Design a protein around this ligand. Sequence first.
Ligand SMILES: Nc1ncnc2c1ncn2[C@@H]1O[C@H](COP(=O)(O)OP(=O)(O)O)[C@@H](O)[C@H]1O
Ligand SMILES: Nc1ncnc2c1ncn2[C@@H]1O[C@H](COP(=O)(O)OP(=O)(O)O)[C@@H](O)[C@H]1O
Ligand SMILES: Nc1ncnc2c1ncn2[C@@H]1O[C@H](COP(=O)(O)OP(=O)(O)O)[C@@H](O)[C@H]1O
Ligand SMILES: Nc1ncnc2c1ncn2[C@@H]1O[C@H](COP(=O)(O)OP(=O)(O)O)[C@@H](O)[C@H]1O
Ligand SMILES: [Ca+2]
Ligand SMILES: [Ca+2]
Ligand SMILES: [Ca+2]
Ligand SMILES: [Ca+2]
Ligand SMILES: [Ca+2]
Ligand SMILES: [Ca+2]
Ligand SMILES: [Ca+2]
Ligand SMILES: [Ca+2]
Lengths: 288, 288, 288, 288
Amino acid sequence: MKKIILTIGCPGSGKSTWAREFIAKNPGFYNINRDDYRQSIMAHEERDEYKYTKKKEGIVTGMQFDTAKSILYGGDSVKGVIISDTNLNPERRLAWETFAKEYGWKVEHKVFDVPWTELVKRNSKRGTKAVPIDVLRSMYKSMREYLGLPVYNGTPGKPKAVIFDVDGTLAKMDVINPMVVELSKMYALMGYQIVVVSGRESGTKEDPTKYYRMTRKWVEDIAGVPLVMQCQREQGDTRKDDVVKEEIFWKHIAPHFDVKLAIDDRTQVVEMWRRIGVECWQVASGDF
Amino acid sequence: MKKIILTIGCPGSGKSTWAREFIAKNPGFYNINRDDYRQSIMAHEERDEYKYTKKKEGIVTGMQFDTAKSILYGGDSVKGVIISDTNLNPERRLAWETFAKEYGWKVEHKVFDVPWTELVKRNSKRGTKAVPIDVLRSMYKSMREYLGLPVYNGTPGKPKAVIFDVDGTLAKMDVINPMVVELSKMYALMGYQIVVVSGRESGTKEDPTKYYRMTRKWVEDIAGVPLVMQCQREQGDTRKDDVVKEEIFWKHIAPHFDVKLAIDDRTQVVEMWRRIGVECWQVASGDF
Amino acid sequence: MKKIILTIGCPGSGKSTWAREFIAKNPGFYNINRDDYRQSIMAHEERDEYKYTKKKEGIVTGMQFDTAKSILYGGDSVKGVIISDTNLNPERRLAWETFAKEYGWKVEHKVFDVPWTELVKRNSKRGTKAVPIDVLRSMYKSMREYLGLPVYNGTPGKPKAVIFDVDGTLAKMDVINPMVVELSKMYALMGYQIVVVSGRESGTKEDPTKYYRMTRKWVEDIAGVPLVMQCQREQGDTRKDDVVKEEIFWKHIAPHFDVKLAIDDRTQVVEMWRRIGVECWQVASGDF
Amino acid sequence: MKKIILTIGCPGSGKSTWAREFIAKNPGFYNINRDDYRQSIMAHEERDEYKYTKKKEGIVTGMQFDTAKSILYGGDSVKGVIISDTNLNPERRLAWETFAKEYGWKVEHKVFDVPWTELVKRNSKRGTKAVPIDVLRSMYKSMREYLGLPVYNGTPGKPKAVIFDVDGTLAKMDVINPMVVELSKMYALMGYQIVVVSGRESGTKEDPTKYYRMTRKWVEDIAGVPLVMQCQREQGDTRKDDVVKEEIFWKHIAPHFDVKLAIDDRTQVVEMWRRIGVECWQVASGDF
Ligand SMILES: Nc1ncnc2c1ncn2[C@@H]1O[C@H](COP(=O)(O)OP(=O)(O)O)[C@@H](O)[C@H]1O
Ligand SMILES: Nc1ncnc2c1ncn2[C@@H]1O[C@H](COP(=O)(O)OP(=O)(O)O)[C@@H](O)[C@H]1O
Ligand SMILES: Nc1ncnc2c1ncn2[C@@H]1O[C@H](COP(=O)(O)OP(=O)(O)O)[C@@H](O)[C@H]1O
Ligand SMILES: Nc1ncnc2c1ncn2[C@@H]1O[C@H](COP(=O)(O)OP(=O)(O)O)[C@@H](O)[C@H]1O
Ligand SMILES: [Ca+2]
Ligand SMILES: [Ca+2]
Ligand SMILES: [Ca+2]
Ligand SMILES: [Ca+2]
Ligand SMILES: [Ca+2]
Ligand SMILES: [Ca+2]
Ligand SMILES: [Ca+2]
Ligand SMILES: [Ca+2]
């Protein structure tokens, strides 16, 4: 059965680079792409900004439809086609299936799950092919939905709480950040539990809690934060703050507290927070 | 007297485009640039990421120095040279002056003040020449210092206050944003004055306060914000929220309140806030 | 009646640049191009060399066909489509007509006649989109056929002759070029008439035959060429040798001699010769 | 002793690509290039055509001089510099040596000998960095001089002769090419020896002279060429006509005849001919 391969990925995820190699190595496969049909009908040059329109979309969609049938209905030489779009819209994916079922073709996916941080990196250097940051956030939000990743929706019965980070949030570089520290105390009065988190490694190979202890002491004897729990990146862990903090949240926090907010300063972490369903306020420029 | 023209501008401000035209129109002028000397000593290709180093910088600085003397010491045909770097570091600018004073040359500046918003726009499409967002923020911070633009440092004797925006901050799209509304009341108890601001146009040409009135009512009868002042973009004003809110701050707020914080959601406005010396917490994704 | 506009031109003739502007200025027009469909089905990157194939061509042709019907069968908003290919193959052009006649559309052409010399120039700088020189010669040969330009096929009854140029051919820079001079005499014995031509301007504004006289004398008293006719670019004429020599051929030579060969050294002139039906031998490197 | 590495090569030979890798792998090495200094002083954009000038050259030369001293006079960290220009001008190369001798540095060369055919290929796709074809011919002529390759200057005492190729020259595709065949006979009368050469493989693995015999017969019984010698690419040889014919010339022709001319049609072969000192007339378009 001739196959139709939908590439599932955010812009900048490796889609096209892979399609080009696959076609180079496997005779009988052809690429179909909407970005290409979008630039061609306007005869746009590499650096022109395409103006979105329902009309133009219907046309490109039509072009994909017709180009698929025509190629798949080619001789026995034809093995399949690659639809190298983002394919991040469920409705769009279903259509390819129904369309494939009536003519007798099968559908396969080829996923390109790339970490948010890397996607941002690439897109900022993508130049003219760059995509706005918010449509990127949205694309990734859809990718997570495709993978079936978790979205927090609260913890019924458990005490409400606010999450505070240390570096850049409660501490500056350490001295206290007056308004944020005053906030944690403000929330405490209001009856909320104060959970503290930090991406600082706990300690060294020989003293595995050196930094943790220092952090705890600082929070207690300088900031005076009435916290109930403190969590930190374990010693030895070299993964991204991104991954580290989320792992800590599902394993040590979500099951014990009804978190209604998170206070942080580092964009990637802030991005992780909103992304998983936790309101987050960014208290300072944290593009690093 | 032969002149040395320093272009003052952030990356993406028009520096090079102007230098190329000026040289094309004025015989006897030559360009000197560090980005160029930086890529050349490494024989880098358009898409390689340059690795910063003191050594490599000393070399490029040396190259600028020597290339300046050699060209300016050319015949009578030579009129001057353009130093098309950002030139946003005061120390760096002084050096060119002292250097120019000993050989008998004069220094002129050619400023390229472009709005933050536009600088971001261009840099995100700059592709490989793109610069990290934080070094851009920093460059612009220096540009503002060069222009002598105002930086807020408080208001002694006046009552402390927090600034809250409406769209996206207190209101969602309208329904209340629970945590942020709860915050304004929380600060009020703490003794702070609550100043409300909005980029929403006050009204229409025929009803110049239509939206203002609606906003006031909403803040009063739905959010229940104990505000003391509300300010909004005047009817007819079509400038950027960027400019609008800052104008409102210096004219109607800074002189009446000791503002210690601002709550907003739109990145450009948040960026304006921190930029002028006002702590600001971004309560939601606002890349628009 | 909705129109289909075929752009007639060699690669590098301005086709696409015009299509982009036309579409920008005229709402309801869309571009259709085979180069675009060719790079897309292979998911090729700007710098990949496309491998020609009947299969791949049938597919792109199919894509043009289907994309035309689908767009032209759009609402009343649709005004037409531009087929921005070279369209230099008569058979190909007919197809568009027959195809247009059955669905009720009309066909218009938009010619981009650019001089060979300029086409070469652009193509050598076209980089990756560059086309081999021989396919370019061929494209231009078809363009000339489209315009109905003249192709020489002899002159019955008139005496046979060979055409010799002076600069670079008979003369070097002047001293004689031994073999070529020996040739003209060799042909004379064989019974051929020797016609001499030169792109050298005849003279100056005040002495309109200064150079002609000098050339005649040189050919007579140094080379010893038994010529019957000498023709030169008139004084004041600043057009390309290209145009100049061909004008001279049809007006002063073709009607008086049965030319069976031309001896020249400058590539553009040599190219003109073969192009119009006259065998030509290039006696030296003349890329200038 | 700190070294100065001059890269010797024609444009498009791999110079820069190598310099970038070498510097990437060897800490303490820096690149110096005139193309880079040429585009920088004019602040030119990738696609601008640089206007040559003595003034601008003196400046770039000065920049190379000063940049060399300054870097080589750096700490002990500095190992050397790469001068990635063509370096094909002997005078220019000497200067680097004398310059290197007074400051105590040594000079090394890194040759990039690439075949003419490949150099043309690359340059035609080089786009904006492309170089005119004649300056390329000239560069390669200098490269050959650097390598010490042979240039023919005649054969005293031996009988004069003309060299004729078969495919495209004497034969068309075979039928006779009337004027060229008539020429060989014309030269024979004049007392010249007619040497025939062909790039056609002599035969097959099982019949190693199949094609040679066919060619000989054709030349004898159809063209009627009064030849004295016929030479052909041996059976099995898969090298370029380029190399094949030159090998045949020095081994089987130059020592037996005083060749004063060569008649061919294929550009690369014609290019080889003039290049080694043999007048050559190109009788037809042979860009293949
Ligand atoms: N492994 C990688 N590391 C860094 N960048 C990559 C990698 N793979 C691809 N890229 C780059 O990411 C960008 C997106 O490429 P692509 O695969 O074509 O996806 P899309 O379909 O969104 O264009 C391109 O600029 C490409 O060169
Ligand atoms: N008026 C403009 N509008 C939009 N973009 C511009 C404008 N002028 C220049 N640019 C672009 O901004 C970028 C920065 O250009 P440039 O003047 O060379 O500054 P820099 O010295 O930082 O490279 C380039 O991509 C350029 O083409
Ligand atoms: N007036 C002009 N002068 C010089 N070059 C031009 C001119 N107009 C277009 N070009 C260039 O010629 C090349 C061919 O352009 P284009 O119109 O797109 O034709 P094609 O359909 O063959 O690609 C491009 O590199 C383009 O920028
Ligand atoms: N092995 C190769 N095969 C084909 N092209 C190459 C190869 N190596 C380099 N090139 C290309 O040849 C051109 C000349 O490259 P470069 O080494 O930089 O020489 P130059 O100093 O003249 O610029 C470039 O476009 C480059 O990418
Ligand atoms: Ca991630
Ligand atoms: Ca932090
Ligand atoms: Ca601004
Ligand atoms: Ca807002
Ligand atoms: Ca012409
Ligand atoms: Ca000539
Ligand atoms: Ca060679
Ligand atoms: Ca041949």
